[PDB]
mmCIF file of C-alpha atoms and ligand atoms in Angstrom:
data_model
loop_
_atom_site.group_PDB
_atom_site.id
_atom_site.type_symbol
_atom_site.label_atom_id
_atom_site.label_comp_id
_atom_site.label_asym_id
_atom_site.label_seq_id
_atom_site.Cartn_x
_atom_site.Cartn_y
_atom_site.Cartn_z
ATOM 1 C CA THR A 1 23.253 -45.338 37.765
ATOM 2 C CA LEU A 2 22.035 -41.873 36.789
ATOM 3 C CA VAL A 3 24.017 -38.657 37.034
ATOM 4 C CA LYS A 4 22.067 -36.010 38.986
ATOM 5 C CA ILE A 5 22.975 -32.372 38.248
ATOM 6 C CA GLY A 6 21.713 -29.158 39.792
ATOM 7 C CA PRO A 7 19.539 -27.546 40.976
ATOM 8 C CA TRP A 8 19.901 -24.097 39.352
ATOM 9 C CA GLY A 9 17.654 -21.357 40.739
ATOM 10 C CA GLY A 10 16.520 -19.948 44.074
ATOM 11 C CA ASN A 11 15.586 -21.125 47.572
ATOM 12 C CA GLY A 12 11.871 -20.380 47.367
ATOM 13 C CA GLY A 13 9.124 -22.889 47.009
ATOM 14 C CA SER A 14 9.398 -26.480 48.193
ATOM 15 C CA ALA A 15 11.795 -29.225 47.120
ATOM 16 C CA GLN A 16 10.409 -31.607 44.471
ATOM 17 C CA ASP A 17 11.890 -34.880 43.284
ATOM 18 C CA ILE A 18 11.065 -38.407 42.114
ATOM 19 C CA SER A 19 11.523 -41.662 43.986
ATOM 20 C CA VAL A 20 11.764 -44.290 41.220
ATOM 21 C CA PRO A 21 14.822 -43.533 39.012
ATOM 22 C CA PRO A 22 13.863 -42.878 35.382
ATOM 23 C CA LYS A 23 14.980 -45.268 32.667
ATOM 24 C CA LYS A 24 13.314 -43.624 29.663
ATOM 25 C CA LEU A 25 11.799 -40.128 29.303
ATOM 26 C CA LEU A 26 8.509 -40.125 27.359
ATOM 27 C CA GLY A 27 7.679 -36.402 27.270
ATOM 28 C CA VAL A 28 7.861 -33.015 28.975
ATOM 29 C CA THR A 29 5.318 -30.189 29.184
ATOM 30 C CA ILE A 30 6.463 -26.723 30.305
ATOM 31 C CA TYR A 31 4.214 -23.755 31.010
ATOM 32 C CA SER A 32 5.878 -20.361 30.893
ATOM 33 C CA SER A 33 5.388 -16.603 30.742
ATOM 34 C CA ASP A 34 8.204 -14.299 31.773
ATOM 35 C CA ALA A 35 9.228 -17.156 34.091
ATOM 36 C CA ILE A 36 9.043 -20.919 33.982
ATOM 37 C CA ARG A 37 5.693 -21.498 35.682
ATOM 38 C CA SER A 38 5.367 -25.274 35.666
ATOM 39 C CA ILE A 39 6.903 -28.508 34.438
ATOM 40 C CA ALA A 40 5.331 -31.948 33.997
ATOM 41 C CA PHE A 41 6.917 -35.088 32.609
ATOM 42 C CA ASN A 42 6.163 -38.794 32.178
ATOM 43 C CA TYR A 43 8.779 -41.536 32.229
ATOM 44 C CA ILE A 44 9.181 -45.288 32.464
ATOM 45 C CA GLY A 45 10.986 -45.976 35.713
ATOM 46 C CA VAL A 46 13.631 -48.655 36.193
ATOM 47 C CA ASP A 47 10.806 -50.773 37.694
ATOM 48 C CA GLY A 48 9.017 -50.712 34.299
ATOM 49 C CA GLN A 49 6.116 -48.608 35.541
ATOM 50 C CA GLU A 50 5.043 -45.318 33.974
ATOM 51 C CA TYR A 51 5.077 -42.323 36.309
ATOM 52 C CA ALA A 52 3.288 -39.084 35.429
ATOM 53 C CA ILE A 53 5.087 -36.362 37.374
ATOM 54 C CA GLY A 54 3.602 -32.990 38.079
ATOM 55 C CA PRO A 55 2.837 -30.518 37.173
ATOM 56 C CA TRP A 56 5.260 -28.885 39.568
ATOM 57 C CA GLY A 57 4.527 -25.187 39.859
ATOM 58 C CA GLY A 58 1.429 -23.345 38.678
ATOM 59 C CA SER A 59 0.207 -19.699 30.738
ATOM 60 C CA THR A 60 2.009 -20.624 27.449
ATOM 61 C CA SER A 61 2.539 -24.378 26.921
ATOM 62 C CA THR A 62 5.663 -25.996 25.427
ATOM 63 C CA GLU A 63 5.063 -29.656 24.631
ATOM 64 C CA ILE A 64 8.034 -31.944 24.044
ATOM 65 C CA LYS A 65 7.307 -35.390 22.633
ATOM 66 C CA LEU A 66 10.217 -37.770 22.512
ATOM 67 C CA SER A 67 11.041 -43.500 20.457
ATOM 68 C CA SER A 68 14.687 -42.826 19.632
ATOM 69 C CA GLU A 69 14.550 -39.087 20.420
ATOM 70 C CA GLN A 70 16.469 -37.864 23.493
ATOM 71 C CA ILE A 71 17.095 -34.530 25.230
ATOM 72 C CA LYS A 72 20.759 -33.873 24.441
ATOM 73 C CA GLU A 73 21.233 -30.257 25.606
ATOM 74 C CA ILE A 74 19.455 -28.219 28.286
ATOM 75 C CA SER A 75 20.250 -24.650 29.332
ATOM 76 C CA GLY A 76 18.519 -21.607 30.712
ATOM 77 C CA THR A 77 18.650 -18.687 33.106
ATOM 78 C CA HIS A 78 17.377 -17.936 36.579
ATOM 79 C CA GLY A 79 16.813 -14.517 38.059
ATOM 80 C CA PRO A 80 14.383 -11.948 39.446
ATOM 81 C CA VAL A 81 10.792 -11.834 38.238
ATOM 82 C CA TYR A 82 7.475 -10.897 39.882
ATOM 83 C CA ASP A 83 9.146 -9.428 43.036
ATOM 84 C CA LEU A 84 10.790 -12.827 43.698
ATOM 85 C CA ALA A 85 14.530 -12.866 43.853
ATOM 86 C CA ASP A 86 15.667 -15.996 41.954
ATOM 87 C CA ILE A 87 13.340 -18.078 39.741
ATOM 88 C CA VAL A 88 14.000 -20.224 36.671
ATOM 89 C CA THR A 89 13.233 -17.693 33.955
ATOM 90 C CA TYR A 90 14.148 -19.442 30.687
ATOM 91 C CA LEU A 91 14.824 -22.949 29.356
ATOM 92 C CA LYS A 92 16.260 -24.178 26.041
ATOM 93 C CA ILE A 93 16.063 -27.885 25.143
ATOM 94 C CA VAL A 94 17.649 -29.516 22.084
ATOM 95 C CA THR A 95 16.901 -33.126 21.152
ATOM 96 C CA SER A 96 18.852 -35.755 19.255
ATOM 97 C CA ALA A 97 16.523 -35.161 16.304
ATOM 98 C CA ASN A 98 17.680 -31.514 16.291
ATOM 99 C CA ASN A 99 14.345 -30.166 17.560
ATOM 100 C CA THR A 100 14.774 -27.022 19.661
ATOM 101 C CA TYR A 101 12.303 -25.819 22.295
ATOM 102 C CA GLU A 102 12.424 -22.531 24.225
ATOM 103 C CA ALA A 103 10.253 -21.360 27.121
ATOM 104 C CA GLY A 104 10.339 -18.140 29.180
ATOM 105 C CA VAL A 105 12.526 -15.048 28.812
ATOM 106 C CA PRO A 106 16.345 -15.018 29.288
ATOM 107 C CA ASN A 107 16.927 -13.162 32.541
ATOM 108 C CA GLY A 108 19.751 -13.693 35.041
ATOM 109 C CA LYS A 109 22.660 -16.102 35.424
ATOM 110 C CA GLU A 110 23.048 -18.897 32.861
ATOM 111 C CA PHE A 111 23.464 -22.649 33.186
ATOM 112 C CA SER A 112 23.962 -25.140 30.399
ATOM 113 C CA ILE A 113 24.445 -28.915 30.059
ATOM 114 C CA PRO A 114 25.578 -29.910 26.516
ATOM 115 C CA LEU A 115 25.711 -33.715 26.613
ATOM 116 C CA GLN A 116 28.076 -35.601 24.323
ATOM 117 C CA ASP A 117 28.288 -39.323 23.470
ATOM 118 C CA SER A 118 25.165 -41.189 24.622
ATOM 119 C CA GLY A 119 24.217 -39.025 27.595
ATOM 120 C CA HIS A 120 20.632 -37.769 27.691
ATOM 121 C CA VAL A 121 18.250 -36.157 30.184
ATOM 122 C CA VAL A 122 15.695 -38.643 31.548
ATOM 123 C CA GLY A 123 14.088 -36.697 34.389
ATOM 124 C CA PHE A 124 13.983 -33.644 36.631
ATOM 125 C CA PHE A 125 13.952 -32.426 40.218
ATOM 126 C CA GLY A 126 14.013 -28.963 41.736
ATOM 127 C CA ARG A 127 11.996 -26.533 43.843
ATOM 128 C CA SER A 128 8.559 -25.127 43.160
ATOM 129 C CA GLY A 129 5.654 -23.094 44.526
ATOM 130 C CA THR A 130 3.503 -21.131 42.073
ATOM 131 C CA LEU A 131 6.576 -21.116 39.697
ATOM 132 C CA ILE A 132 9.674 -23.274 39.132
ATOM 133 C CA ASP A 133 12.033 -21.765 41.725
ATOM 134 C CA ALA A 134 14.860 -24.138 40.781
ATOM 135 C CA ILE A 135 15.392 -26.980 38.317
ATOM 136 C CA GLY A 136 17.743 -29.986 38.148
ATOM 137 C CA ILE A 137 18.198 -32.974 35.829
ATOM 138 C CA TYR A 138 18.736 -36.700 35.846
ATOM 139 C CA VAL A 139 21.128 -37.818 33.107
ATOM 140 C CA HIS A 140 21.319 -41.306 31.669
ATOM 141 C CA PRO A 141 24.864 -42.103 30.535
ATOM 142 C CA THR B 1 -27.194 8.167 43.081
ATOM 143 C CA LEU B 2 -24.776 5.365 41.910
ATOM 144 C CA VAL B 3 -25.702 1.740 42.502
ATOM 145 C CA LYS B 4 -22.942 -0.162 44.314
ATOM 146 C CA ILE B 5 -22.987 -3.963 43.984
ATOM 147 C CA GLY B 6 -20.790 -6.647 45.495
ATOM 148 C CA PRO B 7 -18.179 -7.570 46.398
ATOM 149 C CA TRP B 8 -17.860 -11.156 45.061
ATOM 150 C CA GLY B 9 -14.874 -13.158 46.302
ATOM 151 C CA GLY B 10 -12.973 -13.823 49.504
ATOM 152 C CA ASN B 11 -11.901 -11.938 52.611
ATOM 153 C CA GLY B 12 -8.141 -11.899 52.004
ATOM 154 C CA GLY B 13 -6.081 -8.877 51.010
ATOM 155 C CA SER B 14 -6.883 -5.247 51.787
ATOM 156 C CA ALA B 15 -10.025 -3.295 50.939
ATOM 157 C CA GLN B 16 -9.840 -1.075 47.864
ATOM 158 C CA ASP B 17 -12.240 1.662 46.740
ATOM 159 C CA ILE B 18 -12.373 5.097 45.109
ATOM 160 C CA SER B 19 -13.212 8.370 46.768
ATOM 161 C CA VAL B 20 -14.487 10.506 43.849
ATOM 162 C CA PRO B 21 -17.733 9.010 42.473
ATOM 163 C CA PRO B 22 -17.313 7.947 38.836
ATOM 164 C CA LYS B 23 -19.285 9.546 36.003
ATOM 165 C CA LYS B 24 -17.797 7.967 32.873
ATOM 166 C CA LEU B 25 -15.456 4.956 32.615
ATOM 167 C CA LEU B 26 -12.682 5.329 29.988
ATOM 168 C CA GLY B 27 -10.855 2.040 30.175
ATOM 169 C CA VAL B 28 -9.974 -0.997 32.225
ATOM 170 C CA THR B 29 -6.834 -3.096 32.277
ATOM 171 C CA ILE B 30 -7.018 -6.594 33.726
ATOM 172 C CA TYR B 31 -3.915 -8.676 34.439
ATOM 173 C CA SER B 32 -4.486 -12.385 34.817
ATOM 174 C CA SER B 33 -3.162 -15.902 34.339
ATOM 175 C CA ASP B 34 -5.067 -18.752 36.043
ATOM 176 C CA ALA B 35 -6.734 -16.123 38.230
ATOM 177 C CA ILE B 36 -7.342 -12.392 38.275
ATOM 178 C CA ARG B 37 -4.113 -10.783 39.364
ATOM 179 C CA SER B 38 -4.802 -7.059 39.135
ATOM 180 C CA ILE B 39 -7.147 -4.401 37.846
ATOM 181 C CA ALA B 40 -6.563 -0.790 36.852
ATOM 182 C CA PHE B 41 -9.081 1.641 35.421
ATOM 183 C CA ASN B 42 -9.458 5.279 34.416
ATOM 184 C CA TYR B 43 -12.648 7.264 34.762
ATOM 185 C CA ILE B 44 -13.962 10.815 34.722
ATOM 186 C CA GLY B 45 -15.219 11.731 38.178
ATOM 187 C CA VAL B 46 -18.418 13.634 38.882
ATOM 188 C CA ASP B 47 -16.006 16.577 39.408
ATOM 189 C CA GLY B 48 -14.994 16.413 35.713
ATOM 190 C CA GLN B 49 -11.451 15.168 36.543
ATOM 191 C CA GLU B 50 -9.740 12.046 35.149
ATOM 192 C CA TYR B 51 -8.629 9.534 37.807
ATOM 193 C CA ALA B 52 -6.208 6.688 37.103
ATOM 194 C CA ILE B 53 -6.917 3.943 39.649
ATOM 195 C CA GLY B 54 -4.305 1.400 40.756
ATOM 196 C CA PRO B 55 -3.289 -1.316 39.443
ATOM 197 C CA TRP B 56 -4.827 -3.002 42.504
ATOM 198 C CA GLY B 57 -2.969 -6.267 43.043
ATOM 199 C CA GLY B 58 0.137 -7.512 41.256
ATOM 200 C CA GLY B 59 1.312 -7.149 37.644
ATOM 201 C CA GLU B 60 1.562 -9.593 34.754
ATOM 202 C CA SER B 61 3.308 -9.589 31.422
ATOM 203 C CA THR B 62 -0.160 -10.372 30.014
ATOM 204 C CA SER B 63 -2.928 -7.794 30.228
ATOM 205 C CA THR B 64 -6.405 -7.563 28.769
ATOM 206 C CA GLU B 65 -6.774 -3.892 27.809
ATOM 207 C CA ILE B 66 -10.343 -2.639 27.598
ATOM 208 C CA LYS B 67 -10.343 0.754 25.907
ATOM 209 C CA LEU B 68 -13.894 2.098 25.730
ATOM 210 C CA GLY B 69 -15.091 4.268 22.890
ATOM 211 C CA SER B 70 -16.584 7.649 23.714
ATOM 212 C CA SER B 71 -20.042 5.971 23.634
ATOM 213 C CA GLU B 72 -19.008 2.399 24.556
ATOM 214 C CA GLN B 73 -20.346 1.007 27.825
ATOM 215 C CA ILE B 74 -19.673 -2.033 29.937
ATOM 216 C CA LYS B 75 -23.132 -3.629 29.897
ATOM 217 C CA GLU B 76 -22.490 -7.098 31.334
ATOM 218 C CA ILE B 77 -19.871 -8.232 33.808
ATOM 219 C CA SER B 78 -19.661 -11.759 35.190
ATOM 220 C CA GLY B 79 -17.080 -14.085 36.633
ATOM 221 C CA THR B 80 -16.195 -16.793 39.096
ATOM 222 C CA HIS B 81 -14.412 -16.861 42.396
ATOM 223 C CA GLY B 82 -12.904 -19.813 44.186
ATOM 224 C CA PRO B 83 -9.742 -21.492 45.473
ATOM 225 C CA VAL B 84 -6.428 -21.154 43.643
ATOM 226 C CA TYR B 85 -2.827 -21.884 44.775
ATOM 227 C CA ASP B 86 -3.166 -22.144 48.589
ATOM 228 C CA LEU B 87 -5.832 -19.411 48.776
ATOM 229 C CA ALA B 88 -9.454 -20.201 49.604
ATOM 230 C CA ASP B 89 -11.481 -17.644 47.595
ATOM 231 C CA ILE B 90 -9.989 -15.409 44.850
ATOM 232 C CA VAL B 91 -11.597 -13.879 41.782
ATOM 233 C CA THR B 92 -10.593 -16.447 39.175
ATOM 234 C CA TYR B 93 -12.334 -15.316 35.980
ATOM 235 C CA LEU B 94 -13.954 -12.165 34.577
ATOM 236 C CA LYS B 95 -16.048 -11.689 31.449
ATOM 237 C CA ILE B 96 -16.911 -8.160 30.301
ATOM 238 C CA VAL B 97 -19.297 -7.397 27.418
ATOM 239 C CA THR B 98 -19.683 -3.897 26.040
ATOM 240 C CA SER B 99 -22.442 -2.196 24.145
ATOM 241 C CA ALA B 100 -20.415 -2.627 20.927
ATOM 242 C CA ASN B 101 -20.464 -6.437 21.166
ATOM 243 C CA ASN B 102 -16.858 -6.481 22.386
ATOM 244 C CA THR B 103 -16.192 -9.334 24.819
ATOM 245 C CA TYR B 104 -13.193 -9.641 27.147
ATOM 246 C CA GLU B 105 -12.232 -12.646 29.231
ATOM 247 C CA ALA B 106 -9.523 -13.055 31.852
ATOM 248 C CA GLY B 107 -8.585 -15.906 34.059
ATOM 249 C CA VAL B 108 -10.079 -19.367 33.978
ATOM 250 C CA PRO B 109 -13.651 -20.195 35.093
ATOM 251 C CA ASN B 110 -13.271 -21.708 38.511
ATOM 252 C CA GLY B 111 -15.755 -21.736 41.428
ATOM 253 C CA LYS B 112 -19.030 -19.917 42.160
ATOM 254 C CA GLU B 113 -20.505 -17.675 39.478
ATOM 255 C CA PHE B 114 -21.719 -14.120 39.603
ATOM 256 C CA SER B 115 -23.175 -12.097 36.777
ATOM 257 C CA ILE B 116 -24.573 -8.610 36.298
ATOM 258 C CA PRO B 117 -26.327 -8.235 32.919
ATOM 259 C CA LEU B 118 -27.440 -4.590 32.819
ATOM 260 C CA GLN B 119 -30.535 -3.624 30.827
ATOM 261 C CA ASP B 120 -31.858 -0.209 29.735
ATOM 262 C CA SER B 121 -29.193 2.480 30.192
ATOM 263 C CA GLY B 122 -27.337 0.993 33.182
ATOM 264 C CA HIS B 123 -23.589 0.595 32.846
ATOM 265 C CA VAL B 124 -20.483 -0.140 34.950
ATOM 266 C CA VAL B 125 -18.506 3.047 35.690
ATOM 267 C CA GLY B 126 -16.081 1.854 38.388
ATOM 268 C CA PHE B 127 -14.893 -0.827 40.780
ATOM 269 C CA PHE B 128 -14.006 -1.584 44.404
ATOM 270 C CA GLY B 129 -12.939 -4.753 46.111
ATOM 271 C CA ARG B 130 -10.060 -6.436 47.936
ATOM 272 C CA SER B 131 -6.564 -7.082 46.627
ATOM 273 C CA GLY B 132 -3.199 -8.365 47.698
ATOM 274 C CA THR B 133 -1.013 -10.259 45.287
ATOM 275 C CA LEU B 134 -4.278 -11.138 43.441
ATOM 276 C CA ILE B 135 -7.806 -9.687 43.255
ATOM 277 C CA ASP B 136 -9.404 -11.252 46.347
ATOM 278 C CA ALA B 137 -12.816 -9.723 45.602
ATOM 279 C CA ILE B 138 -14.372 -7.376 43.095
ATOM 280 C CA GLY B 139 -17.408 -5.097 43.192
ATOM 281 C CA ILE B 140 -18.927 -2.519 40.823
ATOM 282 C CA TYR B 141 -20.369 0.959 40.626
ATOM 283 C CA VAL B 142 -23.330 1.180 38.228
ATOM 284 C CA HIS B 143 -24.555 4.380 36.588
ATOM 285 C CA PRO B 144 -28.301 4.070 35.950
HETATM 286 C C1 LIG C 1 1.385 -21.990 46.275
HETATM 287 C C2 LIG C 1 2.636 -22.682 46.743
HETATM 288 O O1 LIG C 1 3.069 -23.694 46.198
HETATM 289 N N1 LIG C 1 3.240 -22.127 47.794
HETATM 290 C C3 LIG C 1 4.441 -22.661 48.412
HETATM 291 C C4 LIG C 1 5.446 -21.535 48.679
HETATM 292 O O2 LIG C 1 5.956 -20.998 47.459
HETATM 293 C C5 LIG C 1 5.878 -19.609 47.497
HETATM 294 C C6 LIG C 1 4.944 -19.166 46.370
HETATM 295 O O3 LIG C 1 4.777 -17.745 46.528
HETATM 296 C C7 LIG C 1 3.792 -17.304 45.591
HETATM 297 C C8 LIG C 1 4.278 -16.124 44.809
HETATM 298 O O4 LIG C 1 4.583 -15.166 45.871
HETATM 299 C C9 LIG C 1 2.966 -15.804 43.996
HETATM 300 O O5 LIG C 1 3.019 -15.391 42.613
HETATM 301 O O6 LIG C 1 2.015 -15.146 44.874
HETATM 302 C C10 LIG C 1 1.383 -16.320 45.506
HETATM 303 C C11 LIG C 1 0.144 -16.009 46.361
HETATM 304 O O7 LIG C 1 0.596 -15.141 47.378
HETATM 305 C C12 LIG C 1 -0.415 -14.732 48.329
HETATM 306 O O8 LIG C 1 -0.885 -15.819 49.073
HETATM 307 C C13 LIG C 1 0.112 -16.422 49.935
HETATM 308 C C14 LIG C 1 -0.562 -17.588 50.660
HETATM 309 O O9 LIG C 1 -0.949 -18.531 49.666
HETATM 310 C C15 LIG C 1 0.766 -15.389 50.885
HETATM 311 O O10 LIG C 1 1.852 -16.035 51.550
HETATM 312 C C16 LIG C 1 1.368 -14.220 50.104
HETATM 313 O O11 LIG C 1 1.847 -13.214 50.996
HETATM 314 C C17 LIG C 1 0.399 -13.609 49.085
HETATM 315 O O12 LIG C 1 -0.173 -12.477 49.771
HETATM 316 C C18 LIG C 1 -1.583 -12.499 49.924
HETATM 317 O O13 LIG C 1 -2.232 -12.122 48.642
HETATM 318 C C19 LIG C 1 -3.516 -12.753 48.774
HETATM 319 C C20 LIG C 1 -4.210 -12.657 47.426
HETATM 320 O O14 LIG C 1 -4.464 -11.307 47.068
HETATM 321 C C21 LIG C 1 -4.315 -12.160 49.975
HETATM 322 O O15 LIG C 1 -5.444 -13.008 50.122
HETATM 323 C C22 LIG C 1 -3.521 -12.089 51.300
HETATM 324 O O16 LIG C 1 -4.184 -11.400 52.355
HETATM 325 C C23 LIG C 1 -2.129 -11.568 51.021
HETATM 326 N N2 LIG C 1 -1.300 -11.536 52.222
HETATM 327 C C24 LIG C 1 -0.950 -10.416 52.883
HETATM 328 C C25 LIG C 1 -0.076 -10.610 54.092
HETATM 329 O O17 LIG C 1 -1.310 -9.294 52.519
HETATM 330 C C26 LIG C 1 2.474 -17.011 46.358
HETATM 331 O O18 LIG C 1 1.902 -18.194 46.939
HETATM 332 O O19 LIG C 1 5.517 -19.475 45.132
HETATM 333 C C27 LIG C 1 6.818 -18.835 44.863
HETATM 334 C C28 LIG C 1 7.250 -19.103 43.388
HETATM 335 O O20 LIG C 1 7.263 -20.538 43.180
HETATM 336 C C29 LIG C 1 7.838 -19.381 45.867
HETATM 337 O O21 LIG C 1 9.078 -18.717 45.614
HETATM 338 C C30 LIG C 1 7.326 -19.054 47.262
HETATM 339 O O22 LIG C 1 8.283 -19.522 48.244
HETATM 340 O O23 LIG C 1 6.561 -22.040 49.441
HETATM 341 C C31 LIG C 1 6.234 -22.655 50.691
HETATM 342 C C32 LIG C 1 7.548 -23.075 51.319
HETATM 343 O O24 LIG C 1 8.322 -21.918 51.577
HETATM 344 C C33 LIG C 1 5.301 -23.825 50.459
HETATM 345 O O25 LIG C 1 4.870 -24.253 51.739
HETATM 346 C C34 LIG C 1 5.329 -25.577 51.991
HETATM 347 O O26 LIG C 1 4.519 -26.522 51.339
HETATM 348 C C35 LIG C 1 4.931 -27.854 51.582
HETATM 349 C C36 LIG C 1 4.102 -28.677 50.593
HETATM 350 O O27 LIG C 1 4.477 -28.351 49.234
HETATM 351 C C37 LIG C 1 4.781 -28.192 53.064
HETATM 352 O O28 LIG C 1 3.402 -28.147 53.425
HETATM 353 C C38 LIG C 1 5.587 -27.145 53.916
HETATM 354 O O29 LIG C 1 5.230 -27.325 55.266
HETATM 355 C C39 LIG C 1 5.213 -25.727 53.490
HETATM 356 O O30 LIG C 1 6.043 -24.758 54.181
HETATM 357 C C40 LIG C 1 4.069 -23.352 49.712
HETATM 358 O O31 LIG C 1 3.222 -24.465 49.477
#
């Protein structure tokens, strides 16, 4: 059973999610400028099938390759950009191998999920249009 | 006395144009990501005055700034227009080449092409078109 946390961000765009619960996160690609513009990710679902999700959204790429490497901390901001009121503007991801990735520009209210013990992020959900209006996470205990 | 060519692109947005005919183009700023988002330009009118036009369309953190030397001319302009996001026909890509072998690109080639390679002394001195949140369509004024 996965923990599902979020979303953080605004009401714009359309809700996005995944149907097969993730077992294992294989990688994440984020495109960003002054806002988080898109996210894509591939995972092995609990059914043992690979799913290539996205991209959700619509610049600068941030590519996150993960066999024993897990997302252990995820944080960011959401706020006003591009005459839109509340968009995910910044993301920071730290892995169990101590690799740190940043995308976007800190702007607005913060959120942060520092996972202890064996917890790790295995997938995402949220809201999107031309940008990532809101983002949420699936967490494997 | 000026040649006016275009526009290329869709029918969305609002029409944009300039009232004082351009004599000399000083610079162009293009804002773009996957498509052309806005254009601004400064020129000397036939009346000897400097006009700062727009930005037509919406802004971006990322601009392509085309500052033209006192003898530098836009000699070739080309691009594409097609569907992006949920819009049918937007200017998606521009390529500008000056007489000093300076090349500028914006957007991502996507859709039908247009191209205006000017020979002899012809050169682009201004623009018109259609804009909203993006550049729906673009056209040019050409000084012979
Ligand atoms: C593309 C997308 O996924 N859109 C979903 C939308 O998300 C909204 C979207 O807003 C975008 C930002 O505003 C952006 O940077 O600018 C984008 C383009 O805006 C022009 O075009 C749209 C139509 O596509 C117009 O609505 C805009 O007013 C805007 O204005 C026009 O500018 C053009 C170009 O110059 C010109 O041609 C027009 O004439 C001019 N209009 C006027 C009046 O002058 C814009 O698309 O993304 C942001 C950021 O992510 C979100 O915050 C926005 O909410 O959300 C809706 C839901 O609210 C989605 O529709 C749903 O889609 C699902 C399927 O996913 C299902 O079909 C639902 O039924 C449907 O409601 C939409 O897909």
